[PDB]
Write a protein that binds this ligand. Structure first.
Ligand SMILES: CCCCCCCCCCCCC/C=C/[C@@H](O)C(CO)NC(=O)CCCCCCC
Ligand SMILES: CCCCCCCCCCCCC/C=C/[C@@H](O)C(CO)NC(=O)CCCCCCC
Lengths: 238, 254, 55, 271, 271, 60, 60, 59, 55, 55
């Protein structure tokens, strides 16, 4: 017998181990592999996909499809705000439940840039210019078109190109940010304002709707695996 | 002389023109094609109707309204009644095919609204009543579109059609992982997808299994000012691509 | 007849399979393939970022 | 590994990197280099931990049962029809893909508890169990001692309490070229009867039982089953399960809100 | 290895190896060869044991808890928020450096004790435990049996009493390029609220619990956690902790004398 | 099975041991190393530093 | 002693395992092999053989 | 490993692959290529699990 | 003095025998011989499929 | 694919890493780097022992 000294951790069961083990079914001939379309290799290929964000998850609308409809209309004043939510993709009632959000909730650390796409869904006769802006954490949250504009932004004119892509760049003191809401790892603020009120001709709808999609850029990544807080259970199903 | 809106598609005796489009979404990047000898199990020689079957069939239209929650059409079946496709479909045990889906809807520069056109493969749906299973008629009505609801569906054996969950228990706003295009009246006119055969088996029966469902849900409600034309229809046109069939026999379905 | 692969760092590790059924082997985690072009840009028409999606 | 950032200066062109047509269905390949000035950043971040393989490769309980050391009439053994939909955790994970293919690493955690009595002079020996797999069609056990436990062909595991938990490996036993996570179809060609994944489901039962009664004192053992996919392959991504699960044999659900609400469409104070 | 001694003879120069200006902040590189005659001595002494790696690389208890095998209402499991400041020993060691970076070797020592009763006929089977780690944000357990113990993703360890203590390895899970031992800052940008290291602190909780109740007789198990840094990196040395510790979440202390006193500034009889 | 003879010290826990052990977190991507100033390699680099001595630690 | 870490599945008995094991009868000299006719190598060589089917398994 | 299928087209001959004399005791080496048209199918199936060794080798 | 054999797939595995009696070795499952001609066509006369069993 | 390093004496020892994550490896104690010049002589101006710190 070759002299052996067992070390701590023996006969232990570690959920995330990774050793070889005896096959209960020897020489089994597995069914040949086919070539199904759309194969996934990494959960990121998912999060790089756009999904609609329920930005207007307001007053009961989360129960309706209206949760995704951003309200916009002709106003008798400039600078009015359109909407705003914090760059907290992981634990934010708005984001957390998207494709990007869902994936994030299976981890604990995240890093990367984000793409917010906006699609104007008003009559082709309607016009207007908007100011989409991201203000890093530090000062308060912008409450004026000014202030908001001193941040990173893009001014989107609604011409034939009805979809504008704002792009929240990664800017943090640390490499990764917690997936949960931790003020140490605050993410900043995302706001949108009227650059030039919605102008419409006669017999054309004044109020329209804007849709918003979230997705990660090619520099996005995640770490630390964990169960989602989103799915519970009381007894075994049947 | 062109516009990435312009577009002419032809298969058999049918032809499609696009005066307003984006591009053409293609399955998962995979373009449909005939099953190779390397991926096959059925040893009998398959039938490849070609022109007689791989052509453009145009289903019954549907009217879009300011309240319309959405529509859907299961697919292997929906063409169960279309010419020689439906036929080869009744006389054979096995079959496989790709598709070119073309949803068409048009309004004026003064109308506004936005539709989501997707192809959900393996769109298993839940029942309105927890204890039961939704009856066939509730699942698909062939060429007749089925409807989603702007609320909870009710009892017996219907499908839980509330739109927010696409009757699949998911977040309707995430359907965008599956092949899709948007029809934004303001800039669009039609949507076109090219779904390739997608399944965990080289071939399957066509009356027992619906390998995917087309859904047309409006996220931006239709609207227009008084005086504008009030009837805005939506029309689905689909064309089988590379259809093979195996296991010939009498016709029907058990 | 073993094999040496590099470890996960910011050095390798030797390894031998002791069983006859490949199913007995450990999970291959040194894998790193990826194609997002399936899910994004699944358009038959290649799009230039600088250009518009309508012209 | 992730892509690093490119150095960006100011621009003035007819190029519209900021505007596209989402109606296309194509996702934008827009980086921060466009729509804003950026420094150069050599990014070393690796996506290694988000690989499909790693997302799934972690033992998870899928079920568990009970059985007594005693009982007249036999009837003191348990069984369970293999399936991965009776647990919320793992199901949702596997259901993030339509079709998947993988080997499985079985790990069992067996424990025994002793219940109250009046019995005296109890000096109970070690407990030895037996888990026996029974492929579909095989003869199933009736009592704690019916001949079928000989497992002349059916594979099974014998284990003595006190040792390291039992473990085996299973190859991809699927009939088709992959496991189906969903099935918008029926069992019979006349759409009558079963509808749902429940039809593809058919992987045999698992039988557990005490080999030795131990003592005359009442004991109750519990077997926990743990799956752990290996060498994974996944196709066609899907929206994670939004509504809670209601049944193990189907997709049934009761309508759920898309997310939680906040006060205004402007409230940063998220819920 | 240490430096050996150089042979020194008598000197007569304007060279002042004996005098400098400490006000410089530079420490003198004065050896005994200067200021006195010395023989030659080849010194072999090695500093091998004072390497940062070796100073830290030794398992140390950082905490421990309790939980009963029984209790109605669930409520018979424990938890502990990972952190290394509740123990005096190791904290002071780690706090001899401002920033550090290292992997961790987790070792658990689980033991069970039985308490007095009236219960009879007790022949208790082996005890099997479960330690489950829960990254921050993950769903936490409520009762000894809430679904979350499936650990479909969260890693955890199952262990049967009587065997070698459990052990795992953890990579450098820090967010920044290193662990911070101190933080003269706040959590919020308006200096309101938490001040101290307590803000960087956020590494999830650890959950323990009995898998099997064993017997109906009352039992109380205790779990001891042991850390052991590996592959260490340390930056910016600090004065060892002089005052005793008073709180786990901050630097708070009550003023302490620099050392102990003696009778005269001339007393060799040290205290 | 390759014949094995376990030796004393098995299943033992020695504070100052030094063996390999399974990783609870596989393929974890650690955050890249930075270059903080003043790195220490050995506790001696500390003791070679001057500190004031409380020589007059007398009467209070 | 060469450091060892036992993994789950130890001291387990798997009906369908397949490891080496000590011989209870050392240096036993087995009786030489003969050449019996009709050797089978796989259960399929059996199923490729014809057998009569009781098609009229009707009424008794 | 199993034998793969051969591509078969239509036939017209005095060849009788469909008829033999079972009275012979010899089992027919008739494949589906005879008596019907078939596509070509490269069959990968293995008989590995039906080997006498594996049929018996189980405690 | 070991030996490497291929595994059962759709990579090899090393192996050494530690015992002196060959009976101690594991079952040889990498085996794959086969002769159905014993059981079928055991006729002294070779039969052509295209031809009749009587002429 | 192992590696031999010298032991701590007044002879070597072989070693192989069995795990894929480098974090699983043992503490590197054969290390011996050292720079006291950080803590002592951190002056921008090099000082000659024989000379005075003021001239
Ligand atoms: C002593 C050793 C005992 C070993 C016991 C091994 C038991 C087998 C465990 C197999 C677990 C497979 C899990 C794969 C998931 C599929 O169940 C799903 C998931 O929704 N649907 C489906 O059901 C997919 C349809 C595919 C049909 C396959 C038929 C075999
Ligand atoms: C079954 C397997 C279970 C494995 C469980 C692993 C649990 C994690 C244990 C990590 C211990 C790290 C100790 C490092 C010391 C830092 O706590 C300090 C010390 O003052 N401050 C700080 O807090 C530094 C701030 C850095 C923030 C890092 C965020 C992750």
């Amino acid at each position: 017998g070759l002299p052996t000294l067992a070390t701590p951790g023996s006969n232990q069961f570690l959920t995330s181990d990774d050793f070889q083990s005896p096959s209960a079914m020897p020489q089994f001939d597995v069914t040949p592999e086919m070539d199904i379309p759309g194969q996934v290799n990494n959960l990121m290929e998912i999060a790089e996909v756009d999904s609609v964000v329920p930005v207007n998850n307001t007053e009961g609308k989360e129960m309706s499809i209206e949760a995704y409809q951003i309200p916009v209309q002709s106003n008798p004043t400039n600078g009015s705000q359109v909407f705003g939510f914090p760059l907290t993709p992981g634990a934010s009632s708005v984001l957390n439940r998207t494709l990007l959000g869902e994936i994030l909730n299976y981890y604990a650390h995240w890093s990367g840039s984000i793409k917010l796409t906006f699609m104007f869904c008003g009559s082709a006769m309607a016009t207007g210019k908007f100011l989409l802006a991201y203000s890093p954490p530090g000062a308060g949250a912008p409450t004026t078109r000014k202030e908001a504009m001193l941040g990173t932004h893009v001014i989107w004119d609604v011409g034939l190109q009805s979809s504008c892509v704002l792009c929240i760049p990664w800017i943090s003191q640390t490499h990764y940010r917690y997936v949960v809401m931790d003020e140490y790892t605050a993410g900043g603020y995302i706001t949108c304002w009227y650059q030039t009120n919605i102008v419409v001709p006669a017999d054309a709808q004044s109020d329209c709707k804007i849709l918003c999609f979230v997705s990660a850029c090619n520099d996005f990544s995640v770490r630390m695996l964990k169960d989602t807080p989103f799915i519970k259970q009381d007894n075994f199903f049947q | 002389g062109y516009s990435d809106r312009v577009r002419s598609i032809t298969l058999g005796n049918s032809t499609i023109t696009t005066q307003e489009c984006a591009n053409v979404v293609v399955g998962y990047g995979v373009w449909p094609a005939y099953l190779k000898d390397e991926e096959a199990t059925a040893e009998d020689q398959p039938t490849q109707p070609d022109v007689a079957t791989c052509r453009f069939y145009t289903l019954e239209s549907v009217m879009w309204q300011q309240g319309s929650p959405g529509w859907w059409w299961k697919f292997p079946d929906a063409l169960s009644n279309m010419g020689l496709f439906g036929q080869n479909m009744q006389y054979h045990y096995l079959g496989r095919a790709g598709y070119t889906i073309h949803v068409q809807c048009n309004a004026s520069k003064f109308h506004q609204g936005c539709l989501l056109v997707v192809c959900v493969p393996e769109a298993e749906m839940g029942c309105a009543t927890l204890a039961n299973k939704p009856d066939p008629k509730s699942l698909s009505k062939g060429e007749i579109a089925s409807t989603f609801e702007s609320q909870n569906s009710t009892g017996e054996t219907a499908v839980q059609a509330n739109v927010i969950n696409a009757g699949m228990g998911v977040g309707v706003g995430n359907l965008t992982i599956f092949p899709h295009q948007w029809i934004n009246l303001r800039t669009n006119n039609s949507a076109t997808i090219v779904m390739p055969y997608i399944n965990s088996v080289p071939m399957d029966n066509m009356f027992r299994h619906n390998n995917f469902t087309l859904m047309v849900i409006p996220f931006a409600p239709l609207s227009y000012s008084a005086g504008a034309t009030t009837y805005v229809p939506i029309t689905v046109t689909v064309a089988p691509m590379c259809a093979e069939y195996n296991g010939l026999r009498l016709a029907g379905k058990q | 007849g073993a094999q040496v692969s590099t470890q996960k760092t910011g050095i390798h590790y030797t390894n031998i399979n002791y069983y006859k059924d490949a199913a007995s082997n450990s999970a291959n985690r040194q894998d790193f393939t990826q194609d997002p072009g399936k899910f994004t840009e699944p358009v038959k028409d290649i799009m230039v970022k600088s250009m518009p999606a309508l012209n | 590994r992730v892509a690093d950032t490119v150095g960006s200066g100011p621009v003035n062109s007819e190029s519209i990197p900021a505007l596209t047509a989402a109606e296309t269905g194509h996702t934008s390949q827009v980086v921060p280099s466009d729509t804003m000035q950026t420094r150069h950043v050599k990014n070393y971040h690796s996506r290694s931990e988000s690989t499909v393989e790693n997302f799934l490769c972690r033992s998870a309980c899928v079920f568990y049962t009970t059985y007594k050391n005693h009982d007249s009439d036999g009837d003191n053994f348990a069984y369970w029809v293999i399936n991965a939909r009776q647990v919320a955790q793992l199901r949702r994970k596997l259901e993030m893909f339509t079709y998947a293919r993988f080997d499985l690493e079985l790990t069992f955690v067996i424990t025994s508890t002793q219940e109250q009595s009046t019995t005296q002079g109890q000096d109970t020996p070690v407990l030895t169990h037996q888990i026996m797999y029974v492929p579909p069609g095989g003869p199933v056990p009736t009592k704690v001692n019916s001949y079928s436990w000989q497992t002349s062909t059916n594979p099974s595991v014998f284990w003595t309490e006190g040792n390291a938990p039992p473990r085996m490996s299973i190859p991809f036993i699927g009939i088709g070229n992959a496991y189906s996570m969903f099935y918008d179809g029926w069992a019979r060609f006349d759409k009558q009867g079963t509808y749902g994944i429940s039809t593809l489901n058919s992987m045999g039962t698992l039988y557990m039982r005490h080999v030795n009664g131990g003592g005359p004192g009442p004991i109750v053992s519990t077997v926990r089953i743990y799956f752990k996919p290996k060498h994974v392959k996944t196709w066609v991504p899907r929206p994670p399960r939004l509504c809670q699960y209601k049944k193990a044999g189907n997709v049934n659900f009761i309508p759920t809100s898309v997310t939680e609400g906040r006060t205004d469409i402007t409230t940063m104070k998220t819920t």
